[PDB]
Amino acid sequence: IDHKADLAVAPLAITYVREKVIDFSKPFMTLGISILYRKPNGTNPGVFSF
């Protein structure tokens, strides 16, 4: 804002509100949000499935 630095080269959301106050370059990478969760315990050991 105050010119006190130059272009902030950093991962930053190109958001609506900052847009009025800062200009933003054509994006270099996209974004998304995904769910994160564990793995299943595992297969049935398959030793004696009988």
């Binding site: 272009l7 950093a10 991962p11 106050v21 200009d23 974004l31 998304g32 995904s34």
Partner: protein, 51 residues
């Protein structure tokens, strides 16, 4: 995926730098340095495959 946002580069307001770094960004994209560069910091260790 759920949503999609944007990583670009911030800049002083109305500065000519932004519009001439945009072309550089686009050039890097339409070259492909972006993808391999992305991998080079995101490669890590490959998980063994699952059925």
């Amino acid at each position: 995926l759920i949503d999609s946002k944007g990583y670009g580069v911030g800049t002083p307001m109305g500065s000519p730098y932004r519009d001439k770094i945009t072309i550089a960004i686009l050039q890097l994209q339409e070259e492909g340095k972006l993808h391999m560069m992305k991998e080079k910091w995101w490669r890590g260790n490959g998980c063994p495959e699952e059925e």
